[PDB]
């Protein structure tokens, strides 16, 4: 077996370690970011729940790293915390240094180098996490990417990770309207989230949501993590509640 250090290679010319990190995603919650010209939505699903769980005054799989860029989480949560904090630190370096907000491509690119660095160097784990990046820069507008646990990035207009990626992806690309709208993103996301999730009635206390818009309150970007009762409004439109 190859398991001892990450300084080795399996006969596929990859490492078994990378495969193990891959699988870590597909036992966590489901995550979907759909981009439109009029705003990008980020959505995540909770992988624990109780009625004595506080989840109505908090989120856990949704962090803003600067006031123009936000991330969703799928993977273990223990892995997540360390790398979020570093992305956010890198953003404020950018702000300090250049007097402006970071591009989406770099911020992701850095983070991807760092994951690969723990594969590359030492007997230290790969970090089995997939993050959905939804950002703005005034060079390529809205930008949706995701970052691999192997540590590479690929651009997008919609993507799903998490649990049942394949099932989710076919469903997203079917219903993708070509101009798209932020209101349709929001609508599509709930529908797609439902079928993967093992509950038949998706609910707002079981939902995390942020929508990013510059298409209303123009000339500036305002990113809003939704409050629980608003999430309830959008659920009522999709006819789930």
């Amino acid at each position: 077996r190859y398991d001892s250090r990450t300084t080795i290679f399996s006969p596929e010319g990859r490492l078994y370690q990378v495969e193990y990190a891959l699988e870590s995603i597909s036992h966590a919650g489901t995550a979907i970011g759909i981009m439109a010209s009029d705003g990008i939505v980020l959505a995540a699903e909770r992988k624990v729940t109780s009625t004595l769980l506080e989840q109505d005054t908090s989120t856990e799989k949704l962090y803003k790293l600067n006031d123009k860029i936000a991330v969703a989480v799928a993977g273990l949560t223990a892995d997540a915390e360390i790398l979020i904090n570093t992305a956010r630190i890198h953003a404020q370096n950018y702000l300090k240094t250049y007097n402006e907000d970071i591009p989406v491509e770099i911020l992701v690119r850095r983070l991807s180098d760092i994951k690969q660095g723990y594969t590359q160097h030492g007997g230290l784990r790969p970090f089995g996490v997939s993050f959905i990046y939804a950002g703005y820069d005034d060079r390529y507008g809205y930008q949706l990417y995701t970052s691999n646990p192997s540590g590479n990035y690929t651009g997008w207009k919609a993507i799903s990770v998490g649990a049942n990626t394949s099932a989710a992806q076919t469903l997203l690309q079917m219903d993708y309207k070509d101009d798209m709208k932020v209101d349709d993103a929001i609508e599509l996301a709930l529908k797609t989230l439902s079928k993967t999730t093992d509950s038949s009635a998706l609910t707002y206390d079981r939902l995390e949501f942020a929508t990013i818009r510059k298409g209303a309150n123009d000339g500036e970007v305002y990113q809003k993590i939704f409050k629980p009762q608003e999430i309830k409004d959008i659920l009522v439109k999709t006819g789930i509640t």
Binding site: Y63, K64, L65, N66, R88, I89, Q92, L95, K96, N99
Partner: protein
């Protein structure tokens, strides 16, 4: 004396009654040469306003410095930084360097949202708590302003009353200082509304 004295420039903040004003001059000079007639010394991280006096480099550099720390504070805790808590921070951060201490005299002002009480605080090179509910003045014309502001201050004032007091104060004191003046701008934080009123004054 110090480098803070060579470059100069004034930031004065004051309290009335459920309001603050923090105002500044538009002069940046580097010694004898006047450099900009329009460099604003007022900056802000949420509702907390940070003025900066002193050497020209540290006006730009410390601004970047305190921006960095208020942005990590804001995101993690999901609330605005408070003027009560920012006073703690300014004093420790400047104290980090003591063997290369930053040569500035800041003024912090804001209004706390967890009580609505008005807060102004004064600092020096490496900063100390200096608590006021009256006024904190700073710069090369600070000795003029300390008396000018006391003289015109009448305790307990309206948001509209406080404009008058800080304007007459700045107007003569900046003018009758070498290294200060050359325009002024006044920010009246009424509670959470900020109106910006440019002072027509002469070019010094």
């Amino acid at each position: 004396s110090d480098p803070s004295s060579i470059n100069g420039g004034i930031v004065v903040a004051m309290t009335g009654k459920d309001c603050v004003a923090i105002a500044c001059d538009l002069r940046l000079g580097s010694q004898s040469l006047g450099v900009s007639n329009k460099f604003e010394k007022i900056f802000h991280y949420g509702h907390v306003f940070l003025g900066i006096t002193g050497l020209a480099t540290d006006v730009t550099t410390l601004n970047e410095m305190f921006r960095y720390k208020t942005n990590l504070y804001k995101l993690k805790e999901e609330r605005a930084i408070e003027p009560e808590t920012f006073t703690q921070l300014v004093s420790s951060s400047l104290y980090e360097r003591r063997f290369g201490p930053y040569f500035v005299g800041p003024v912090v002002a804001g209004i706390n949202s967890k009580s609505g009480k008005p807060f102004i605080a004064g600092f020096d090179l490496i900063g100390c708590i200096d608590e006021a509910k009256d006024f904190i003045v700073s710069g090369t014309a600070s000795d003029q302003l300390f008396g000018m502001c006391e003289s015109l201050y009448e305790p307990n004032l309206e948001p509209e009353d406080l404009f008058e007091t800080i304007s007459q104060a700045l107007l003569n004191a900046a003018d009758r200082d070498a290294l200060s003046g050359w325009g002024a701008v006044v920010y009246i934080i009424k509670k959470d509304e900020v109106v910006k009123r440019y002072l027509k004054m002469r070019q010094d």
